[PDB]
């Protein structure tokens, strides 16, 4: 259910979080239930219970939030001085 849908779940999870960064408000409860499922799957793993959560979601998330704020950092500097930046 997750691994065959990995290429479509985090493809649009990063879309709705990026939609949240744009200003609009997505469904909070649905989002948090999906993300918490990624760590609750491995609740029986004695070692590395967050390994699935990091490798499937967090690492694509940090990469996505990396090229978004770098896009945002270059967006703010054009029309804002350091006083308001």
Coordinates of C-alpha atoms in Angstrom, one line a residue:
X1 CA 0.0 0.0 0.0
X2 CA 2.9 2.4 0.6
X3 CA 5.8 1.2 -1.4
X4 CA 3.8 0.9 -4.7
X5 CA 2.2 4.2 -3.9
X6 CA 5.5 5.9 -2.8
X7 CA 5.9 7.5 -6.2
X8 CA 2.5 9.1 -5.9
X9 CA 2.0 9.8 -2.1
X10 CA 5.1 11.9 -1.5
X11 CA 4.7 13.3 -5.0
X12 CA 1.6 15.2 -3.7
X13 CA 2.4 15.3 0.0
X14 CA 5.2 17.7 -1.0
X15 CA 2.6 19.4 -3.2
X16 CA 0.2 20.1 -0.4
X17 CA 2.9 21.2 2.0
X18 CA 4.2 23.5 -0.7
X19 CA 0.6 24.7 -1.1
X20 CA 0.6 25.4 2.6
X21 CA 3.8 27.4 2.2
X22 CA 2.1 29.4 -0.5
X23 CA -0.4 30.7 2.0
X24 CA -3.5 28.6 1.6
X25 CA -4.5 26.0 4.2
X26 CA -4.8 22.3 3.3
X27 CA -6.4 19.7 5.5
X28 CA -4.3 19.4 8.6
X29 CA -5.7 16.2 10.1
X30 CA -5.5 14.2 6.9
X31 CA -1.9 15.3 6.4
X32 CA -0.7 14.5 9.9
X33 CA -2.4 11.1 9.8
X34 CA -0.6 10.2 6.6
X35 CA 2.8 11.4 7.8
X36 CA 2.4 9.6 11.2
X37 CA 1.6 6.4 9.3
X38 CA 5.1 6.4 7.9
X39 CA 6.5 6.0 11.3
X40 CA 3.7 3.8 12.7
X41 CA 4.3 1.1 10.1
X42 CA 7.7 0.2 11.6
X43 CA 6.4 0.2 15.2
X44 CA 7.5 -3.4 15.5
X45 CA 11.0 -2.9 14.2
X46 CA 13.4 -3.2 17.2
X47 CA 16.1 -1.2 15.4
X48 CA 15.6 2.0 13.3
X49 CA 11.9 2.5 13.7
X50 CA 12.2 5.8 11.8
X51 CA 14.2 4.4 8.9
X52 CA 11.2 4.2 6.6
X53 CA 10.0 7.6 7.6
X54 CA 13.4 9.2 6.8
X55 CA 14.1 7.3 3.6
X56 CA 10.6 7.6 2.0
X57 CA 9.4 11.0 3.3
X58 CA 11.9 13.1 5.3
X59 CA 14.8 12.9 2.8
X60 CA 12.5 13.9 -0.1
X61 CA 11.0 16.5 2.2
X62 CA 14.4 18.1 3.1
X63 CA 15.4 18.1 -0.5
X64 CA 12.1 19.7 -1.5
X65 CA 12.2 22.3 1.3
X66 CA 15.8 23.0 0.3
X67 CA 15.1 24.0 -3.3
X68 CA 12.0 25.9 -2.2
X69 CA 13.6 28.3 0.3
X70 CA 16.6 28.8 -1.9
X71 CA 14.0 29.7 -4.5
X72 CA 12.4 31.9 -1.8
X73 CA 15.6 33.4 -0.6
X74 CA 16.4 34.6 -4.1
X75 CA 12.8 35.8 -4.4
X76 CA 12.9 38.1 -1.4
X77 CA 16.3 39.7 -2.0
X78 CA 15.1 41.3 -5.3
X79 CA 12.5 43.7 -3.8
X80 CA 13.6 43.9 -0.1
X81 CA 16.5 45.4 1.6
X82 CA 18.2 43.9 4.7
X83 CA 16.0 46.0 7.1
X84 CA 12.8 44.2 6.0
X85 CA 14.4 41.0 4.7

